[PDB]
């Protein structure tokens, strides 16, 4: 048959979503990310912590841990933070509590991130200096605070890409080189549907779950 039928239908489905009320819902979420340009360093640091907590967890869970703790990401001592995370349901409370505390030396994360030439270079800094932050987490963070040209390459999109033959094998470990390589394929798909990577990510998640989170 036509080996490109599934790719062609994915493009068609996304164009269908863009012509539905789903577009307004996703656009609103995108606008909320963009609003971070006006939020404080403290607000940005909380989002960085949300992303540090995402791995092996739920966005919905992260959102509630955020609302629960809030200012505590900056004021709570190691021991007290580790305690709240354990009681809030996070299985890696110990490691995450440590990463968060260590990240505090960069608490003015908004000023640091905006000082860079662009988001790509800023991502490099996030990955290299902040423990608990890999390329996926850094991209997730940048997207959530308003940047549009970084892909969030999670284990689900990797499986979809592999299964539909966009990549030869599920990577497991993503080196900088491999991350940027896979990000470019997603970037091409995005342009094929006239969507930025920040937006494409939400359309893809919506197709997978019917929900629009962050």
The residue to which tokens 């599920």 are assigned: 170
**Is 28 a residue of the active site?**
no
63, 24: one domain = no
- DSSP per position, 155-207: HHHHHHHHHTTSSSS--SS--HHHHHHHHHHHHHHHHHTT--HHHHHHHHHHH
> Strands, E, within 15-168: which ranges?
none
135, 156: one domain = no
Q: Determine the Cα–Cα distance for residues 141 and 189; give it in Å rounded to an integer.
A: 22
70 φ, ψ to 5°? 60, -120
From 110, 136, 148, 201, active-site residue: 136
Q: What Å resolution does this PDB entry report?
A: 2.0
98, 123: one domain = yes
61, 141: one domain = yes
Count of other CB atoms within 10 angstroms of residue 160: 16
Angle at 66 between CA 69 and CA 97, to 5 degrees: 65
**Is 172 a residue of the active site?**
no
- DSSP per position, 59-80: HHHHHHHHHHHTTHHHHS-HHH
Give the number of domains in the chain. Answer: 2
57, 104: one domain = yes
Q: Determine the Cα–Cα distance for residues 164 and 210; give it in Å rounded to an integer.
A: 21
Determine if residue 63 is left, alpha or beta; phi over 0 gives left, psi from -120 to 50 gives alpha, anything else beta.
Answer: alpha
CATH code of 98's domain: 1.10.340.30
CB 12 within 8 A of CB 6: no
Q: Determine the Cα–Cα distance for residues 133 and 140; give it in Å rounded to an integer.
A: 10
Determine if residue 171 is left, alpha or beta; phi over 0 gives left, psi from -120 to 50 gives alpha, anything else beta.
Answer: alpha
The separation between the first and the last C-alpha atoms of the chain, rounded to the nearest angstrom, is 37
From 39, 86, 154, 178, active-site residue: 154
Count of other CB atoms within 10 angstroms of residue 78: 13
Q: Determine the Cα–Cα distance for residues 153 and 179; give it in Å rounded to an integer.
A: 8
153, 140: one domain = no
Domain with 34, as residue range(s), is 1-38+149-214
CATH code of 181's domain: 1.10.1670.10
138, 91: one domain = yes
Q: For the chain, how big is the Rg over CA atoms in Å?
A: 18
């Amino acid at each position: 048959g036509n080996h490109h039928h599934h790719h062609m239908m994915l493009i068609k489905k996304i164009e269908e979503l863009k012509n539905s009320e789903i577009k307004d819902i996703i656009d609103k979420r995108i606008q909320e990310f963009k609003s971070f340009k006006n939020k404080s360093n403290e607000e940005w640091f909380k989002e960085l912590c949300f992303c540090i907590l995402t791995a092996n967890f739920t966005a919905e869970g992260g959102i509630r841990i955020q609302k629960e703790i809030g200012d505590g990401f900056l004021t709570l001592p190691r021991e007290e933070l580790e305690e709240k995370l354990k009681n809030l349901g996070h299985r890696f409370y110990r490691k995450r509590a440590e990463y968060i505390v260590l990240a505090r030396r960069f608490k003015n994360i908004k000023d640091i991130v905006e000082s860079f030439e662009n988001e790509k270079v800023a991502r490099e800094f996030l990955v290299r200096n902040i423990k608990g932050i890999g390329y996926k987490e850094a991209s997730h963070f940048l997207r959530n605070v308003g940047y549009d040209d970084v892909a969030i390459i999670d284990r689900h999109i990797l499986r979809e890409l592999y299964e539909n033959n966009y990549i030869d094998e599920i990577p497991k470990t993503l080196s900088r080189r491999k991350y940027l390589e896979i990000e470019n394929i997603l970037r091409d798909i995005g342009e094929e549907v006239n969507l930025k990577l920040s937006e494409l990510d939400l359309y893809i998640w919506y197709l997978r779950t019917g929900k629009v989170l962050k």
